[PDB]
Design a protein around this ligand. Sequence first.
Ligand SMILES: CCCCCCCCCCCCC/C=C/[C@@H](O)[C@H](CO[C@@H]1O[C@H](CO)[C@H](O)[C@H](OS(=O)(=O)O)[C@H]1O)NC(=O)CCCCCCCCCCC
Ligand SMILES: CCCCCCCCCCCCC/C=C/[C@@H](O)[C@H](CO[C@@H]1O[C@H](CO)[C@H](O)[C@H](OS(=O)(=O)O)[C@H]1O)NC(=O)CCCCCCCCCCC
Ligand SMILES: CCCCCCCCCCCCCCC
Ligand SMILES: CCCCCCCCCCCCCCC
Ligand code: NA
Ligand code: NA
Lengths: 203, 203
Amino acid sequence: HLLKPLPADKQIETGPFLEAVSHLPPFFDCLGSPVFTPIKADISGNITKIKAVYDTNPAKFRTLQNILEVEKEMYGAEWPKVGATLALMWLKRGLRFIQVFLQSICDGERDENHPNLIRVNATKAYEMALKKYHGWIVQKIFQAALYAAPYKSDFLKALSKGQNVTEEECLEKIRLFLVNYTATIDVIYEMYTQMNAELNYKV
Amino acid sequence: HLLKPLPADKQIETGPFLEAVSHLPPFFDCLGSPVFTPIKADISGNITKIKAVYDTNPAKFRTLQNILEVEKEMYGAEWPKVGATLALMWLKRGLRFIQVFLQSICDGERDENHPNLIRVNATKAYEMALKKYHGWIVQKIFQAALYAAPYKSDFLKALSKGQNVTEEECLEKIRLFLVNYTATIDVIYEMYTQMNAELNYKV
Ligand SMILES: CCCCCCCCCCCCC/C=C/[C@@H](O)[C@H](CO[C@@H]1O[C@H](CO)[C@H](O)[C@H](OS(=O)(=O)O)[C@H]1O)NC(=O)CCCCCCCCCCC
Ligand SMILES: CCCCCCCCCCCCC/C=C/[C@@H](O)[C@H](CO[C@@H]1O[C@H](CO)[C@H](O)[C@H](OS(=O)(=O)O)[C@H]1O)NC(=O)CCCCCCCCCCC
Ligand SMILES: CCCCCCCCCCCCCCC
Ligand SMILES: CCCCCCCCCCCCCCC
Ligand code: NA
Ligand code: NA
């Protein structure tokens, strides 16, 4: 479930984007703990919200840019803290977490003392994508939750279950996925900047 | 939204029980933090599951005892870790948490160093109702989450907002609620014992 390549105009079609990222919450099951259940629910809830908006008028909401532009017009001063704009503001952070996490694993980043954990990789991704938006209590909850993360080898095997591929092949496929995925996330973040749609409030 | 008194036969009608406890998740908002959102979702999800079972045949599922008896018959060896029996096994723990927490506040239990927090009351309730069913990682997550709890005075005011009553009056109304609520929870727990429907697994 690769993302589509970016067109020259860098516009991201909403329908296909939603279809693609809808495949990402299931992989949370690959972490193997109920600790990750509310996480999968938050990301799913963002996707549901954006889809619900889109479905009201797919042509009006053809692209993610259209969502922001249209909602900016539709709403008052509560924008961008409303609607699919808010849902995508949070979704992009989760998407970026996943991106940074996977990229870190693929790049061979590891605690040389504990080379088969994924805590360093998840911590980096958390720092880069989400931490700034969490108050100290939520940050404490993340640090605790990371102990529930699987072994690296197990996580990777879970990502390729049934395919009977080597770890090296699994990582090559992740790297392939990361190309259009990273590009797409980067464009989304830049659009939030350009539209002055980004907020910095903590939860 | 008082619970009904217990009849001589101690049978608890499912429909009215569900209607009554459906009023309890909203009061989570009285804690004033997003930290409690996944908690309210778990308890709501149990109530939804039990209601969904009940709705298949309200007469068959007339009482909570009926639910356990019928599901024991309907299911194989997966019972009691299935169905509305499992949902109620977890719901009762949340209900008991609430009971112990409220009763502790009403009984004047406090950290004399910090008399306007509710951490001691919530810790006691957690220890008595849920802790045993949590692995160490989830227990760490609870301890962290408790820091998000409101001041006692604020929590109580939030429970009576609009009514313009004193704290003393608010607590008298809580104490009234606790009579049939405690009795009902105690019967539920005893039924799980009698039916050998209780499990001790940790999450
Ligand atoms: C039982 C004993 C007691 C203990 C219970 C305490 C439990 C406390 C758990 C707290 C955290 C649950 C995770 C969810 C966090 C969320 O609060 C945030 C903000 O969530 C956003 O809020 C907005 C309003 O401000 C809108 O409602 C958004 O919704 S809208 O659709 O309405 O616009 C919504 O996503 N999302 C987040 O921070 C994003 C989560 C992304 C995670 C990325 C993967 C990381 C994996 C990490 C590895 C560990
Ligand atoms: C974003 C950065 C990363 C950080 C994110 C990490 C977040 C981790 C949060 C973890 C905890 C969320 C709370 C939910 C816990 C639940 O896991 C448990 C068991 O839940 C049960 O599981 C069963 C299967 O075994 C069935 O599915 C039940 O469902 S069924 O309906 O299918 O049968 C379900 O209730 N319920 C519980 O432990 C019960 C909760 C009761 C709480 C009572 C009020 C206490 C208030 C406490 C004050 C603090
Ligand atoms: C601390 C664990 C958080 C890990 C979050 C990753 C779960 C999603 C996995 C996405 C895999 C998509 C790969 C497709 C090639
Ligand atoms: C650490 C905070 C957990 C508190 C859980 C209590 C929330 C539910 C309040 C129930 C109030 C019902 C009173 C009716 C009279
Ligand atoms: Na690179
Ligand atoms: Na007493």
